[PDB]
Short mmCIF file of N, CA, C and O in Angstrom, two decimals:
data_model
loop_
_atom_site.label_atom_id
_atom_site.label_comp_id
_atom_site.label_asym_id
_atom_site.label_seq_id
_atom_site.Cartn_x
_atom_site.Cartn_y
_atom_site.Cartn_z
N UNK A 1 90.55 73.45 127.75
CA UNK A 1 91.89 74.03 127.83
C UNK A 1 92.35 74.55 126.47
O UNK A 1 93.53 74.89 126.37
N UNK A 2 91.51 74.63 125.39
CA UNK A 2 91.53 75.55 124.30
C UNK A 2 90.71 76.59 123.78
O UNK A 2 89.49 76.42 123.83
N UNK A 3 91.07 77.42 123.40
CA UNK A 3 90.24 78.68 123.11
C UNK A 3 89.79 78.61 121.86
O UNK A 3 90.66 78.69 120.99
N UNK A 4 88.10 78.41 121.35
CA UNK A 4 87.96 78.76 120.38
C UNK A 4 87.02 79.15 120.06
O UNK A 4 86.11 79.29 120.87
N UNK A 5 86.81 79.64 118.08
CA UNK A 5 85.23 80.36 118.19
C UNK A 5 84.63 79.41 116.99
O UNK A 5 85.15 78.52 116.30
N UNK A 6 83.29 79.97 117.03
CA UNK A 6 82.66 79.31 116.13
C UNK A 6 81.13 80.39 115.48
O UNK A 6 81.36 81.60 115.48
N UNK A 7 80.23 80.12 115.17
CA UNK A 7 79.11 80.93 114.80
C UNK A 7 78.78 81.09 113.11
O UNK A 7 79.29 80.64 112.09
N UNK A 8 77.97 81.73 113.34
CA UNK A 8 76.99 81.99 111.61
C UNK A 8 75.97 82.95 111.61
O UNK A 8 75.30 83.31 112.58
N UNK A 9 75.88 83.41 110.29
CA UNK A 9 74.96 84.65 110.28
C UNK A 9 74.49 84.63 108.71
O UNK A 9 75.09 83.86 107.96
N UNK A 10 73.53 85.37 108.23
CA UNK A 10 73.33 85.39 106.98
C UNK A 10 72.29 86.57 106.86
O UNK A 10 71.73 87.13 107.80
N UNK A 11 72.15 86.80 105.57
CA UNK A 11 71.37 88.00 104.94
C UNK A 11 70.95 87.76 103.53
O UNK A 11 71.62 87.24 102.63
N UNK A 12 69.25 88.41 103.45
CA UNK A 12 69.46 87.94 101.75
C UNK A 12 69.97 89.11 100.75
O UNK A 12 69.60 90.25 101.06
N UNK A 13 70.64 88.99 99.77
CA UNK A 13 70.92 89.52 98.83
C UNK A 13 70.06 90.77 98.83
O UNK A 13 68.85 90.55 98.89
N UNK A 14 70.65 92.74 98.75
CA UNK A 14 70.23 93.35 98.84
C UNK A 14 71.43 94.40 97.88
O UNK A 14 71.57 95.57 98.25
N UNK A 15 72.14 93.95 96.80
CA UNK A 15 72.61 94.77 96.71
C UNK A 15 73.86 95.53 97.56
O UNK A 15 74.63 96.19 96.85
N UNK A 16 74.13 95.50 98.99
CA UNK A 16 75.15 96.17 99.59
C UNK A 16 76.12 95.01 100.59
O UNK A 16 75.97 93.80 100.78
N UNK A 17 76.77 95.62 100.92
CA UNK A 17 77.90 94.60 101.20
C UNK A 17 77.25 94.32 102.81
O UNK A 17 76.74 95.13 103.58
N UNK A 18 77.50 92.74 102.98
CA UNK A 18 77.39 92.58 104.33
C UNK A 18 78.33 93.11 105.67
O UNK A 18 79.52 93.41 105.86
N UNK A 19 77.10 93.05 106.49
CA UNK A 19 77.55 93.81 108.19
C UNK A 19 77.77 92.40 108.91
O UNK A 19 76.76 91.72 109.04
N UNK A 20 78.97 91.90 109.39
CA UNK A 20 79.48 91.35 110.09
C UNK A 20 79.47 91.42 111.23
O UNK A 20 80.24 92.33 111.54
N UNK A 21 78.88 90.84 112.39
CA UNK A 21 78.46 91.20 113.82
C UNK A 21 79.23 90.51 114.97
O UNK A 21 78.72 89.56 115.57
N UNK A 22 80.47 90.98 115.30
CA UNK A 22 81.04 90.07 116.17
C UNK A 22 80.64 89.52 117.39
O UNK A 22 81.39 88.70 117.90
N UNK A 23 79.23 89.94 118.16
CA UNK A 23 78.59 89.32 119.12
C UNK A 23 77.90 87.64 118.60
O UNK A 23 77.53 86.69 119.27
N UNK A 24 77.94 87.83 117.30
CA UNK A 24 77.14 86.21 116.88
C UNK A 24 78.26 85.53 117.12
O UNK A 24 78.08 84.33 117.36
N UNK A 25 79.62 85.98 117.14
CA UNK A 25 80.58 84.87 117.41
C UNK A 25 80.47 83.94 118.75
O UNK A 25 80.39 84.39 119.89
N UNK A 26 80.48 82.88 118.47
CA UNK A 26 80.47 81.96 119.80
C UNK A 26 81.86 81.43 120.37
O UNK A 26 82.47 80.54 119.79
N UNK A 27 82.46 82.18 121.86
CA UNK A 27 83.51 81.31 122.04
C UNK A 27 83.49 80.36 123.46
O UNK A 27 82.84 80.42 124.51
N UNK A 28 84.34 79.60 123.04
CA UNK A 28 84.65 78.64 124.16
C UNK A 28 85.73 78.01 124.58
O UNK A 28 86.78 78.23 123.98
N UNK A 29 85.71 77.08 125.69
CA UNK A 29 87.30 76.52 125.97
C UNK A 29 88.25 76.75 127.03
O UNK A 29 89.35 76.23 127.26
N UNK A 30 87.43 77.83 127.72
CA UNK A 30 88.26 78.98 128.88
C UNK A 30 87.26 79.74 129.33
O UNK A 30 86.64 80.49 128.58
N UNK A 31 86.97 79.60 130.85
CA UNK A 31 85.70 80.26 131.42
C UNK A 31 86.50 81.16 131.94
O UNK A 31 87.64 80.95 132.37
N UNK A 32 85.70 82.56 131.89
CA UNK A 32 86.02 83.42 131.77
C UNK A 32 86.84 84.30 130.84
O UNK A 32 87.16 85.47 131.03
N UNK A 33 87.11 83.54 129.80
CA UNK A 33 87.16 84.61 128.74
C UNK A 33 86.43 85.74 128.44
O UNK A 33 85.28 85.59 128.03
N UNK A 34 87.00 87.15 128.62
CA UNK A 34 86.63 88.06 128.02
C UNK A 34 86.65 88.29 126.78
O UNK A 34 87.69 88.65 126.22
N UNK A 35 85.63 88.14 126.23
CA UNK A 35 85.64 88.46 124.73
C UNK A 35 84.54 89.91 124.27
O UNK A 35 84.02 90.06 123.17
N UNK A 36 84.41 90.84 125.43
CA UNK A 36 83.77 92.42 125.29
C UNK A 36 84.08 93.04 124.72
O UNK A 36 83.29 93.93 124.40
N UNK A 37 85.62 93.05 124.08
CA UNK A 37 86.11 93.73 123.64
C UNK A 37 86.33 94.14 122.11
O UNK A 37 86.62 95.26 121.69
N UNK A 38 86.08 92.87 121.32
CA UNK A 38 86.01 92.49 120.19
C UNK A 38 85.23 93.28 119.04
O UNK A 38 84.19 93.63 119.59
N UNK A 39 85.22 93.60 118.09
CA UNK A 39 84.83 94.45 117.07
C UNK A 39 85.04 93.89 115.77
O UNK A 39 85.87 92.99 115.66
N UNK A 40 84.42 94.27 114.80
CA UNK A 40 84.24 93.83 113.52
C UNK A 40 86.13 93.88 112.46
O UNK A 40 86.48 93.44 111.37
N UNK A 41 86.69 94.49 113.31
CA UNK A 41 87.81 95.16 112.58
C UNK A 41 88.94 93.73 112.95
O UNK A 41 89.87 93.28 112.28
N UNK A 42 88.43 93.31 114.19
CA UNK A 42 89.00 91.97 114.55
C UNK A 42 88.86 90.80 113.83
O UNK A 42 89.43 89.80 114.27
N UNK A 43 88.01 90.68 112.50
CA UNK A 43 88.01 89.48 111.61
C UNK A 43 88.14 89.90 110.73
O UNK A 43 87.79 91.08 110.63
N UNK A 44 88.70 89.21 109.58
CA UNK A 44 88.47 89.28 108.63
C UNK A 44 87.93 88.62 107.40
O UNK A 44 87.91 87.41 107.60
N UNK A 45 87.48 88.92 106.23
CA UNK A 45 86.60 88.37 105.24
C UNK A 45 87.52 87.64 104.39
O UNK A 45 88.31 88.27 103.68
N UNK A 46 87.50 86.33 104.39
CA UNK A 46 88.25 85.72 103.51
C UNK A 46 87.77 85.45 102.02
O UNK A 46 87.36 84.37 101.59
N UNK A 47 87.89 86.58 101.36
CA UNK A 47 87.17 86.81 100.39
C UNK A 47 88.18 87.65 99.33
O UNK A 47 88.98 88.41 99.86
N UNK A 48 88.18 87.57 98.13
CA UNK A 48 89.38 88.04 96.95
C UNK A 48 90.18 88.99 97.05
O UNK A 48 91.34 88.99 96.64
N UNK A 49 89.37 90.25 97.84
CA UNK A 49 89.70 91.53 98.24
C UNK A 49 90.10 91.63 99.82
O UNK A 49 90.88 92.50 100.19
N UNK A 50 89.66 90.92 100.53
CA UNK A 50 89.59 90.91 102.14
C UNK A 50 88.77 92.23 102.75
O UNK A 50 88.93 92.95 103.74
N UNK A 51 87.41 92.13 101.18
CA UNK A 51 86.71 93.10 101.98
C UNK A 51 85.16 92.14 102.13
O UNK A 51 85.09 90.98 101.72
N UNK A 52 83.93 92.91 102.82
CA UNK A 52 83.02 92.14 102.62
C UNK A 52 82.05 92.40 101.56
O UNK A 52 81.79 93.47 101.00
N UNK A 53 81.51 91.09 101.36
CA UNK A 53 81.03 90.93 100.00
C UNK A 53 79.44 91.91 99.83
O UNK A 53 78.89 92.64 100.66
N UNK A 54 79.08 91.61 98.63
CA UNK A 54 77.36 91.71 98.26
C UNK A 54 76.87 90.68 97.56
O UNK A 54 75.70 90.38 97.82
N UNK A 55 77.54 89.90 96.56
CA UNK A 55 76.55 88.74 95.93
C UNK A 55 76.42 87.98 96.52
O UNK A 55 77.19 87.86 97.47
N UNK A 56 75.38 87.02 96.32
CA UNK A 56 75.01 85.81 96.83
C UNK A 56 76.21 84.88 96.77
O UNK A 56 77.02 84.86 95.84
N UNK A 57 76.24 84.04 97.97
CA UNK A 57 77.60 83.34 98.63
C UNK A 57 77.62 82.70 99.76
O UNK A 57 76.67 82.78 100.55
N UNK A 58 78.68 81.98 100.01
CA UNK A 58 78.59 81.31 101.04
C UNK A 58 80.47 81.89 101.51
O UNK A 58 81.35 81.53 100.73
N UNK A 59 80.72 82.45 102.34
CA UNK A 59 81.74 83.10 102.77
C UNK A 59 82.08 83.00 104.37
O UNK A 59 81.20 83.08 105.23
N UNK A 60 83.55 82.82 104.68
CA UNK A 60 84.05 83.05 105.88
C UNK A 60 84.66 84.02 106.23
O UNK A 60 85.01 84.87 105.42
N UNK A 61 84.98 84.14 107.84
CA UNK A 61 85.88 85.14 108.58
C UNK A 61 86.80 84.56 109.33
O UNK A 61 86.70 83.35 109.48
N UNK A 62 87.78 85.19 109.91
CA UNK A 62 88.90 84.72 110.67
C UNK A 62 88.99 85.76 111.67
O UNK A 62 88.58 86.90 111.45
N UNK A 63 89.56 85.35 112.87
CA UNK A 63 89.52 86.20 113.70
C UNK A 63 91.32 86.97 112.96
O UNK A 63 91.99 86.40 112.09
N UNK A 64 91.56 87.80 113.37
CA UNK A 64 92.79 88.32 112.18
C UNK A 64 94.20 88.97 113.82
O UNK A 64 93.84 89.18 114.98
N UNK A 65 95.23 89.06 113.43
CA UNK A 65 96.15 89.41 114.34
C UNK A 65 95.96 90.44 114.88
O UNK A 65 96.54 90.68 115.94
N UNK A 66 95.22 91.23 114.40
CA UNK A 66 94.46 92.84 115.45
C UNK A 66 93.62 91.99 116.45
O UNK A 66 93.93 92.25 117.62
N UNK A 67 92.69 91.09 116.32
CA UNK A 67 92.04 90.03 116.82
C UNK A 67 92.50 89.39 118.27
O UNK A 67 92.01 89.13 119.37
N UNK A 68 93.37 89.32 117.77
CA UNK A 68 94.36 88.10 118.58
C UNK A 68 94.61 88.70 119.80
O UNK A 68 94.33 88.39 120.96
N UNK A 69 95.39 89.93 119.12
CA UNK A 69 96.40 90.84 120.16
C UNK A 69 95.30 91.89 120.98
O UNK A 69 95.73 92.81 121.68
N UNK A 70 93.94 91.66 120.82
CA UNK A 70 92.53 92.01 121.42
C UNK A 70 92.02 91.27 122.41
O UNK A 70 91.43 91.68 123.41
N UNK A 71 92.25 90.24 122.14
CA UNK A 71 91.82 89.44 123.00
C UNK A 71 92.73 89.01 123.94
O UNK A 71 92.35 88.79 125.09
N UNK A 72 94.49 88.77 123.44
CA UNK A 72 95.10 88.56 124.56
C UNK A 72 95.30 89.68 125.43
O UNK A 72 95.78 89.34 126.52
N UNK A 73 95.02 91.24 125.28
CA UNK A 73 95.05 92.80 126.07
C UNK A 73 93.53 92.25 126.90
O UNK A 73 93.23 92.73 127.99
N UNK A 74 93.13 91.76 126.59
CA UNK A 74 91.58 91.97 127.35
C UNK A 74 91.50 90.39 128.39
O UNK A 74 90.50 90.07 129.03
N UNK A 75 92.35 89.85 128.36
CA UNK A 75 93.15 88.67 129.47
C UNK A 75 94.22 88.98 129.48
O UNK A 75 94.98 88.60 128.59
N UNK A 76 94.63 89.78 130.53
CA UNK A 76 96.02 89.29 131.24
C UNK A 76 96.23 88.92 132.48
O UNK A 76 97.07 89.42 133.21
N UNK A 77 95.32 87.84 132.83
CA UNK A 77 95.49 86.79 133.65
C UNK A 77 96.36 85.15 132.69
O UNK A 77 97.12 84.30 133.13
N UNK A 78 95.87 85.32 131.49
CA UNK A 78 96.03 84.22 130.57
C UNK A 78 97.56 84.64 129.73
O UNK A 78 98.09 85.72 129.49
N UNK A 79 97.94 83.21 129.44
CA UNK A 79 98.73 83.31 127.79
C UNK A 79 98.16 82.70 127.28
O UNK A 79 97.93 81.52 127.53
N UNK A 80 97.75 83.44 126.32
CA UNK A 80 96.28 82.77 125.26
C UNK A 80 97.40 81.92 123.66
O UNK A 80 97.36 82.55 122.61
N UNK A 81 98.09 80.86 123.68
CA UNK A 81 98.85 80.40 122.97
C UNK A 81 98.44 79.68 121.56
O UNK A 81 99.25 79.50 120.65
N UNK A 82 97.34 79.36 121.52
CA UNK A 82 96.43 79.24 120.57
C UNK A 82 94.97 79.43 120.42
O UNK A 82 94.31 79.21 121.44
N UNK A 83 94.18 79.88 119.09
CA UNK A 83 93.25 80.57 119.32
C UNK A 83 92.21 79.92 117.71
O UNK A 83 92.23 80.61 116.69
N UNK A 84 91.39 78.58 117.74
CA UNK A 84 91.45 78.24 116.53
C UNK A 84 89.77 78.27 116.32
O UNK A 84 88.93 77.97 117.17
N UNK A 85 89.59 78.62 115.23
CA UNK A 85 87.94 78.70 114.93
C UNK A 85 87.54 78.59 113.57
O UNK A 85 88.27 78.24 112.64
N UNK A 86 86.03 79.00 113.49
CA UNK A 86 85.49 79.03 112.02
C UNK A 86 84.34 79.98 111.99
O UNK A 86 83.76 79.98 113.07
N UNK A 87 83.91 80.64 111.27
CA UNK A 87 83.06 81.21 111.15
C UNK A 87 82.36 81.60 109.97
O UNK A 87 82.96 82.35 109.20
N UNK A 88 80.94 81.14 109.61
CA UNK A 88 80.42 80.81 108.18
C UNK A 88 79.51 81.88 107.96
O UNK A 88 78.60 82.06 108.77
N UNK A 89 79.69 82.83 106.68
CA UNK A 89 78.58 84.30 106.47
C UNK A 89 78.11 83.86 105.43
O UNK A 89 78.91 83.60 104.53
N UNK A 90 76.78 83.66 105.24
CA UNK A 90 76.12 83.53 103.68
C UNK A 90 75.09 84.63 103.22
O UNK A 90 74.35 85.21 104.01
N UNK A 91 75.13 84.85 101.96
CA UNK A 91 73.80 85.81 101.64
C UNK A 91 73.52 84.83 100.24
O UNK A 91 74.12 84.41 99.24
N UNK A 92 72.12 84.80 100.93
CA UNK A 92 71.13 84.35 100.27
C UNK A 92 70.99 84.98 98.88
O UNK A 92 71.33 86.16 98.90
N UNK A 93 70.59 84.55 97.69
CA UNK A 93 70.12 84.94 96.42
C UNK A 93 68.85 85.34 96.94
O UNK A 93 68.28 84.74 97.86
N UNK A 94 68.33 86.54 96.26
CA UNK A 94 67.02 87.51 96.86
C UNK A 94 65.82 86.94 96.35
O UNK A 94 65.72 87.58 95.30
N UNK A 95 64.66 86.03 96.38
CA UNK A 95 63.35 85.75 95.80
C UNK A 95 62.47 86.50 94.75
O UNK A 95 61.42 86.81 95.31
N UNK A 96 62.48 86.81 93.82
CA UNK A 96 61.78 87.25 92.58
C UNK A 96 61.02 86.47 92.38
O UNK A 96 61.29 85.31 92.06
N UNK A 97 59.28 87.16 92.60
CA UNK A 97 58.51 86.24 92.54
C UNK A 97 58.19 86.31 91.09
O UNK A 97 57.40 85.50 90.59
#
């Protein structure tokens, strides 16, 4: 009887900023949640700039109020009243042999 997400992803160190994939998100709590709708623009990088990073790191996302108001348009069978999660992005330092 709560809605929430969870998931992880990572990349090694390449120089360019990481791609954030909102299908790795895992949610749960409410069968039948539609969550099809969802897009990268729906989290955000909790990171200095609130953009996404390139160095090596261990970094999160949040699902963000564009997010929210996405997911409650894509249920309106529901009042989706809370919505609580975590989501962990790391990039690896790159191997120099």
């Amino acid at each position: 009887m709560k809605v929430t997400y969870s998931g992880s992803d990572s990349k090694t160190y390449d120089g360019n900023p990481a791609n954030f994939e909102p299908t790795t998100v895992q949610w749960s709590g409410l069968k039948g949640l539609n969550t099809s709708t969802l897009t990268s623009a729906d989290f955000t990088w909790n990171t200095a700039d609130k953009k996404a990073p390139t160095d090596a790191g261990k970094y999160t996302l949040s699902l963000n109020t564009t997010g929210e108001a996405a997911l409650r348009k894509a249920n309106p069978n529901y009042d989706l009243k809370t919505i609580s999660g975590s989501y962990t992005y790391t990039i690896n330092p790159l191997g120099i042999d």
